[PDB]
Design a binder for this molecule. Sequence first.
Ligand code: ASP
Ligand code: ASP
Ligand code: ASP
Lengths: 426, 426, 426
Amino acid sequence: LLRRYLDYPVLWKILWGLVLGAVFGLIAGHFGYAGAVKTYIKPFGDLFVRLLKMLVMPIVLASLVVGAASISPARLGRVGVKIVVYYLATSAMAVFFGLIVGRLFNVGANVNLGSGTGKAIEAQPPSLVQTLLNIVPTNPFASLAKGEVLPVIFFAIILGIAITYLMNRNEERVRKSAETLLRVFDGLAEAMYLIVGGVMQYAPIGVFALIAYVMAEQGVRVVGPLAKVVGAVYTGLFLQIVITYFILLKVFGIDPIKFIRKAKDAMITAFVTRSSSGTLPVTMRVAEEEMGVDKGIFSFTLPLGATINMDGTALYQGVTVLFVANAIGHPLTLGQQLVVVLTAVLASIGTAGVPGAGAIMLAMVLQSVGLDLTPGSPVALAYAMILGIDAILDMGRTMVNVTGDLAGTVIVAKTEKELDESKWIS
Amino acid sequence: LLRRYLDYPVLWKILWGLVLGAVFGLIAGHFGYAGAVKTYIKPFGDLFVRLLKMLVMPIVLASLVVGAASISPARLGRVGVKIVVYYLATSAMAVFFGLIVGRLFNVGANVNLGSGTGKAIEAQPPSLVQTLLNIVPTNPFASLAKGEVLPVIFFAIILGIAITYLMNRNEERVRKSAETLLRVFDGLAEAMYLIVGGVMQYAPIGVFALIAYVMAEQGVRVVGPLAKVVGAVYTGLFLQIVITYFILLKVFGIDPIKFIRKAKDAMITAFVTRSSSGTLPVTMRVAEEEMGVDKGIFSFTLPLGATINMDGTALYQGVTVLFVANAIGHPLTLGQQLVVVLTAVLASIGTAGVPGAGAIMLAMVLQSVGLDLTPGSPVALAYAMILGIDAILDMGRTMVNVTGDLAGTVIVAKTEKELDESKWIS
Amino acid sequence: LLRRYLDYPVLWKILWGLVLGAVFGLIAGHFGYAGAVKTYIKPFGDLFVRLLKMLVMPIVLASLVVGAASISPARLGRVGVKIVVYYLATSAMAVFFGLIVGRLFNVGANVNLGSGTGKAIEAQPPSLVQTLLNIVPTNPFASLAKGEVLPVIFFAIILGIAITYLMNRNEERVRKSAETLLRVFDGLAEAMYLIVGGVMQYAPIGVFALIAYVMAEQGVRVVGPLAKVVGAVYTGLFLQIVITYFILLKVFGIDPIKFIRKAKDAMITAFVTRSSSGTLPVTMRVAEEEMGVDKGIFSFTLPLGATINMDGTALYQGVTVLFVANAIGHPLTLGQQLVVVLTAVLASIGTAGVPGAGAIMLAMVLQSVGLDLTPGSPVALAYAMILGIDAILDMGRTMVNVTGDLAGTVIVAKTEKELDESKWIS
Ligand SMILES: N[C@@H](CC(=O)O)C(=O)O
Ligand SMILES: N[C@@H](CC(=O)O)C(=O)O
Ligand SMILES: N[C@@H](CC(=O)O)C(=O)O
């Protein structure tokens, strides 16, 4: 029905598309025409993923500039520290919980890939200082072109601070220019939120392609030892939520039951669309209208958290590294655990908020702890067997990412007295 | 003389330079000093081409944004469909006319390059779905840097739609920011039109370099079987015009004689400067002041048409592919004809409006239908033989491109009743 | 202490850090802690260098636009000619002075690298016309991303001219758009000046880390034949200043003593921070508040001069080429001198204003005059010992670059009557 497709609620409609995609993938696996749906329908999902990749650099740049320029630098610094310490602490806690649930379920135990006794002693080159110096961009236009996210974030936040210093100057010729630049970037961020609204109204037909192709191709590829991985990552994410976010929220004052009951309208959308930087309008309109946090707190943290605060992806990498280490016969140790918790943070933070980017950055952590990536080694086979259920793991780790984003912004607000205390009373 | 060069009319001057360049190239070929003019004068033409390549990406981005944001989304959609269907239909018709004139003039009859009976069976991998999914940019700043055009066009048109949806919003801090971003891109597009006016003022001394070097270097290279090529491409372009544009215009109501009579002041400039995206000010100032269409049409269609709607380049590729195939001993068939008509459209649409870009993109269509591109095969020899008179073919296909752009915008206006009917009556 | 560090004067602090860096580098070389300071402290200097590279493309683009858009093209043309002629003349004079001081000190005479009698005859391929046609960018966004400066300069200056032509228009729809674009770029350039002024608050610890690492690593590497090079480059720079800038300034009317006295507050900062494009706020404020030149000059000539006018770097290259030629047995002659003076100008102009870039662009002048750059030739050893002491030469050539910039803008003002004749009396 023309014009009626758009009229269904983008939340329920996209969930309806996701719950139909599984049925259609199963009926295709019954027909056994996986090639037909890989050639016909899969391009829809790939176009949707390209659409959601188009809106990761401009949004992060413009929105970070606007957020960091709409705050007084004192309040901006306070919120920045109180949000960055939280992001790093919860990222490390998520990686540790991932390692815990890995040791508990013993993922990848009887795959028998059997890597030879060759190059195995080199295990810990953590290049901390270099991957931290790579934050400041050498040339911001380059770091925008090539696609690096964290350098663009740093440059945007320093430009925002510069602008918020400029609008207090004395020359009326230099105030009305910073004002105009800030209004330019604000118009850009708002146009990008409208574009994401459009892409999200399109997203049901894209999810019905992505998940249907994933099913029809892996309709029988979820029976082997990958069952333990997919039942370990979800248990790790649930434990992450109910043991970290609950503790934090309940300690700081907000009731976590209400937190989930209010955030579900964005948790579900992030779950279905499996993309952090593609659900910023929904999470911001559920932080403002429902969670009740003023513009100063949720116009900077949530634009930031949706690109660096990645707890789900961090736990996914933490369990997957241990899986691939257990598959070829090298279980990690205490030192390897304390180096992988250090490198998974810096490998998930630098990840863009686009689908399928949690497996790409898995290279920068497999190459980190000893392992190689050449297609000749069995680690290539394990990497492919992970990239298989990449989709079913992303569709949960993105939800946990967005939930952690909302928990962090709500906690930073509760530590700034700017909450909408009326909502949490009834 | 000082300050007199500029005051001379840019239309007559750009033709005076082209009519002097032929004579000077011929006298140089007489003197046999083609090396002297290739080392001394050619840098002028190369500077001119570099300028006209500088003025292709900013213009397309800014002007597409402004055109797509200065129109209501309903009228924008109507005109967009009515212009895209036209562009595709006329591109396919131009490619078919090129194939016809090729099959009747028998281009590439006896060159005797003699390709072996080797790799020839792989002849039709048309990657339609992938080259159509390559429209949505993965990272628009990247697609701006690397030089891709069609992704920038898509991103600019979606940003224009977002902006024209913003200026109707109620939050006053958003309307006044969308207005500021739109005026930024409008100032950019207008500065670019002024820069193109300056480049056109410079263009006579650049044409007297380009065409003079081409003459002095190919003063005798227009005698062999390339005579049939240059006499088939011009006949194909003339047939294209007088059989497609005449039919369309006379059916829709406008008299085509008057169309050419009013458009010649841009047809000639396109013919000489051999660059679509370098004559946008001239074609827009001949569509507004003379053709008589309001901004809603010549501010979007002509900025779009002069970058994707390329009938001359499409016909040139359609005849050149058949030439190359007939030269080494493999004349195309009905299926190869129906695959080359499909791939020439997508190989000319993605071409930038800069000189000498109709031979560059000839790779994406020679590599498409069977042929290879390695310098070891005779296909490299045929490719160089074409790139020889590439200039004399471009100087016509650009004119046909711009004429088709004007015909299309006039027709889309004639369906929208936006014509200035006063110019027609007399 | 806390916040007292910032309030400490930036010039005296940036000098005190550099004076303490030598002492700490020497006390480290005493303990033999070169590795410790290379692993711990050096990242601070590398972060400072990356910060000063972040602010070289946006500053040059925005500031060149706002400089060449606030000047009427009538005055802008005169100023541009009078400034580019000066820049090229003093660049060639600096290269000649470098060659003179080289021939009188005989740098690199007893290193005994001893390059064999192999490839030596190819010595003068000066590609003047091509490296001059490389000024106009092929795609300005590409020239911004990849990092080429001069194309960005040309594009920014032509956009500035287009904007200052648009502002004098009739349609109120385009005048406002041009003014808004101009104020956007003005806000951007001013935000960048604020960002730089922030970096210079952090610059003392960075220029302490840099010089401390350089000391502790080359604390004994300044005893060999590199002493003659480090004592020839400084004598060349002093000769440059006192024999070109003094004579020009005294000819045109200003007293050079007063010029040095009023410019030392930026000469010292450039000497320390060893970066031209990183001291634009200081040099512009000392040209305005102390030198006394209106926004017609010090807003365009200085943003250009501090990016293209590099006399110190040119003399550094002119002496280093002769050094590496005398080292491996190939002393230059009159023709080699008159080609190296031609190519060092175009190798210094294309050098970005970031630390350690003269050493990089030294490749584009060694490859020009005969020499190669493969790691197999002895040039991989000679070139290595020059780059070894890059700091103690760059920290002087940057000072001379900025001093020449100030001399040039002051002379262009004194030839335009805009000079503040009040400061030069007492
Ligand atoms: N879904 C992840 C990205 C990915 O794993 O592809 C995110 O939150 O950005
Ligand atoms: N002149 C063609 C391009 C080319 O063939 O170089 C155009 O219309 O854009
Ligand atoms: N010192 C030079 C740059 C360099 O050679 O590193 C300048 O002032 O721009």
